[PDB]
Ligand SMILES: C=CCSC[C@H]1Nc2cc(Cl)c(S(N)(=O)=O)cc2S(=O)(=O)N1
Ligand SMILES: C=CCSC[C@H]1Nc2cc(Cl)c(S(N)(=O)=O)cc2S(=O)(=O)N1
Ligand SMILES: N[C@@H](CCC(=O)O)C(=O)O
Ligand SMILES: N[C@@H](CCC(=O)O)C(=O)O
Ligand SMILES: [Zn+2]
Ligand SMILES: [Zn+2]
């Protein structure tokens with residue numbers, strides 16, 4: 028059977044090619060995760076179809092209804108066979124789906140417009156002039172919501188009650204907000220996305236401070252799926268043969284505009 | 286039953302306590318992995334005994350005989366229930382044992398005596414005045430042995446044939462060799478150990494260049510062991526609550542001597 032791959036439009040993991048309308052199937056997309064999928068499938072010996080997650084989300088469990096949305100949801104409810112995306116390995120997710128060893132490392136980080144008077148999370152927490160928020164429905168939000176650390180609980184306390192909302196529906200929305208707010212908004216997002224955007228025109232944002240945590244993205248499959256074994260091994264192999272580092276440079280730094 | 290934990294004397298993961306000559310059982314030891322074991326066993330609800338691996342090795346397979354030595358062999362042959370140590374996740378190991386998600390990140394790196402005229406692996410490869418080597422029966426050696434990369438292959442070709450041997454039986458041997466070779470020996474070892482030593486008297490070594498690869502340590506169990514599941518989830522939990530970051534700072538930078 029052809030493996031259904033759920034993924035998500037997020038630069039530079041997966042992007043529409045500048046001419047997709049004249050192309051079909053997997054050929055419409057490009058990016059780090061597009062390249063990885065081809066490699067995973069070749070080594071694991073399967074055919075596959077990339078499909079963009081319907082609700083444009085990563086995956087969260089609705090408190091009350093207990094329904095999972097996003098890519099996680101499509102794996103849990105049987106819509107997809109595998110997720111190849113910047114999907115963060117987390118405990119609540121590991122409880123309902125299987126993750127391979129990480130194919131890329133990241134930490135929550137701070138994006139500012141250049142010249143913004145901010146060096147750290149502690150800095151953000153001690154003031155109110157500069158607003159700050161995170162993506163919706165993602166691991167970054169949950170990090171803050173669940174945190175017992177001082178600086179982080181205070182930040183959550185501010186963020187949850189800020190109005191207008193400091194949360195964004197997409198990474199692009201967050202970046203645009205930083206860019207348009209003249210230094211009055213900072214965005215909390217994963218280091219990988221932060222570093223990509225830092226290398227893109229108009230070159231007006233930067234990552235500041237150390238990361239808030241340390242984790243990674245994993246390739247995910249439905250709990251107990253037979254795919255898991257092969258896919259995990261393929262990730263280790265590709266990692267050892269230098270493919271992942273090659274892809275990272277290809278899509279982040281080789282392209283560099285700044 | 287009491288879990289038999291296999292581990293290895295390797296600073297600052299597992300070290301004999303000072304007062305040492307007065308304690309019994311697990312109490313004899315201190316370090317990152319010592320603290321990690323306690324936490325894991327707490328959250329998984331088991332009692333355990335720390336045992337120092339008999340042959341003092343991480344684990345590799347004898348080509349010719351195909352028998353695994355080191356901590357890997359102790360799991361494969363049934364002498365131990367779990368390994369908690371700076372044990373690198375690799376493809377050939379994953380094929381015979383199970384690893385949790387990584388609990389710490391590292392990459393292969395270069396340690397020099399301060400002032401040694403070397404800035405990179407390329408630098409090492411381009412010259413002969415300064416000898417260099419790696420640990421025996423570990424993942425770093427295998428890295429070079431199996432490397433297709435131009436720079437590293439040339440380094441391996443030199444290393445496998447050098448005389449006197451440039452390989453060492455333990456990290457401590459490698460480090461003493463850098464320190465007493467007046468800059469004529471560079472040691473290839475994992476960034477984690479390199480950074481620890483760099484902050485310890487006599488403060489005469491340093492890490493130079495960037496990491497050659499990106500990987501991680503995992504807690505290992507015999508393949509298909511039931512313990513594996515609980516252990517993995519315990520690592521995730523510990524990661525998310527910040528204990529892992531707590532432990533790292535305790536054993537690396539809070540110690541700082543330089
Ligand atoms: C869902 C998560 C899968 S990976 C979790 C992760 N945990 C950590 C924690 C720490 Cl403190 C470190 S570090 N900075 O001490 O090295 C590294 C990692 S990880 O990236 O190896 N995995
Ligand atoms: C623990 C078992 C297998 S881990 C293999 C590893 N691969 C890489 C590769 C890269 Cl290039 C990166 S990075 N530097 O681009 O973020 C990260 C990882 S990993 O640590 O997530 N896993
Ligand atoms: N990688 C995150 C989404 C981005 C973020 O939350 O910063 C996730 O899997 O939920
Ligand atoms: N961490 C390595 C040992 C140290 C090294 O090879 O540099 C292993 O698990 O084999
Ligand atoms: Zn003694
Ligand atoms: Zn605990």
Ligand SMILES: [Zn+2]
Nearest residue numbers: 347348349350
């Ligand atoms: Zn032999």
